[PDB]
Design a protein around this ligand. Structure first.
Ligand SMILES: Nc1ncnc2c1ncn2[C@@H]1O[C@H](COP(=O)(O)OP(=O)(O)O)[C@@H](O)[C@H]1O
Ligand SMILES: [Mg+2]
Lengths: 68, 359
């Protein structure tokens, strides 16, 4: 039941924030900062204000289905 | 003009060369504890001329990434400000750590600190008065500080303090310090003259700030009940004694200043900050956690004042831990740490104006 919660190779922050309001979008941006601190993701941003892409980090992290 | 962006290279936790920004008119810097927000505040202070001893290091070279643990990343580091002005090419102001010493540069030409400070002053950036920077835990002290220290701020900004040496000399030559001061018409005239000059310099600044502060405190409070009063203890010679600051918060009864809440003191401090700007405008403010003591009502009123002022009057760069405040900015600069020999800080940029601030 927990084994079937497969995921993607990358997560687009801008895709996550589609149809969100400003406070929701800010909270997702902030959660990316916290996940990076926890080494749960790696982050790339091609240039300032481009999309921000998360890929799996070197530490395991739980509850990533609700975080994404 | 405005601060278009900051470029940082190997300064404290900011390893490598990084662009900070570009800034919008109202930008908030955010991030989890330990990410490097305070180090970014230090980088701003550093490029704007802050003394090394106020940057939390024992030597200038300890500002190079990795230097505090004997693993410096390089023999140099820098912070650079790109300053933009309508109708003008961008101007770059940089401070470079080279050989344990500071080198100042304007558009990649080395200048001495005197010329650096002088060029900044022409833009409204006073690196001695530093009336555009509010450090973490400091905003309330602006409203509650010693009346005599408030006078020193006005003497620095107005340049009346430049005349204090001559004033003191002429006062003594007129007989000050004798049991019965007796002065000729001439030595008295020389003192009345320097006193008038210091008075006029001081009042050219103080009277403007005092006559504009009430409207600003009303506009921050967004109520007509609110009142702010700036007055000299010594009206004839304002520079000799303290500058009193008293406020009446709106829908409130009068209280003295140390009886106000942390949040009420914060709003009073910001009114004084912005009243100084109405006399001698700075192009941007850097405000480190000034929302710490603000409730959500006052956060809204402060952010609205900034937004209805960041189009025209000034630019605001804020560091904030409170989503109620930073979600009112146009863009976010998010700081995050990376693992390494030392903590490495890097930043992301996020445009909030893409999303409706509603439901
Ligand atoms: N010269 C330096 N080289 C490498 N790391 C540094 C240097 N100076 C400070 N740091 C690190 O930066 C971190 C502190 O960053 P800080 O800006 O104070 O975090 P916060 O976001 O909580 O304000 C500490 O790990 C501190 O040791
Ligand atoms: Mg800090």
């Amino acid at each position: 039941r927990a084994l079937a919660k497969t995921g993607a190779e990358s997560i687009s922050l801008l895709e996550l924030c589609r149809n969100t309001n400003r406070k929701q979008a800010a909270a997702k941006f902030y959660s990316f900062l916290v996940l990076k601190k926890q080494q749960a993701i790696e982050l790339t941003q091609e240039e300032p204000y481009s999309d921000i892409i998360a890929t799996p980090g070197p530490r395991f992290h739980g509850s990533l289905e609700v975080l994404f | 003009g405005f601060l278009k962006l900051i470029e940082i290279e190997n300064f404290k936790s900011y390893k490598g060369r990084q662009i900070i920004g570009p800034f919008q008119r109202f930008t908030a810097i955010i991030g989890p504890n330990g990410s490097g927000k305070s180090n970014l505040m230090d980088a701003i202070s550093f490029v704007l001329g802050e003394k090394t001893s106020n940057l939390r290091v024992k030597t200038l070279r300890d500002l190079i990434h990795g230097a505090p643990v004997g693993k410096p990343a390089a023999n140099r580091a820098f912070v650079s400000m790109v300053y933009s002005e309508e109708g003008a090419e961008d101007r770059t102001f940089a401070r470079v750590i080279v050989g344990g010493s500071s080198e100042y540069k304007i558009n990649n030409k080395v200048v001495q600190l005197h010329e650096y400070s002088e060029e900044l002053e022409k833009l409204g950036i006073l690196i001695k008065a530093r009336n555009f920077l509010v450090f973490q835990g400091a905003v309330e002290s602006i409203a509650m500080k010693n009346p005599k220290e408030r006078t020193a701020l006005f003497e620095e900004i107005s340049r009346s303090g430049e005349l204090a040496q001559e004033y003191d000399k002429r006062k003594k030559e007129m007989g000050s310090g004798s049991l019965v001061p007796r002065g000729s018409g001439s030595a008295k005239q020389a003192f009345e003259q320097i006193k008038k000059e210091r008075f006029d310099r001081f009042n050219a600044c103080f009277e403007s700030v005092a006559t504009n502060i009430d409207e600003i405190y009303k506009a921050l409070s967004r109520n007509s009940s609110a009142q702010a009063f700036l007055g000299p203890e010594n009206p004839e010679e304002p520079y000799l004694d303290g500058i009193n600051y008293n406020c009446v918060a709106p829908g409130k009864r009068f209280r003295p200043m140390d009886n106000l809440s942390g949040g009420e003191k914060t709003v009073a401090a910001l009114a004084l900050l912005f009243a100084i700007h109405s006399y001698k405008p700075a192009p941007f403010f850097v405000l480190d956690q000034i929302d710490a003591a603000l409730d959500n009502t006052n956060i809204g009123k402060v952010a609205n004042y900034i937004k209805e002022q960041s189009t025209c009057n000034f630019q605001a760069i804020v560091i904030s831990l409170k989503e109620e405040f930073y979600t009112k900015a146009e863009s976010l600069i998010g700081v995050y740490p990376e693992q390494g020999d030392c903590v490495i800080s890097k930043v992301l940029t996020f445009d909030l104006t893409k999303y409706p601030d509603a439901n």
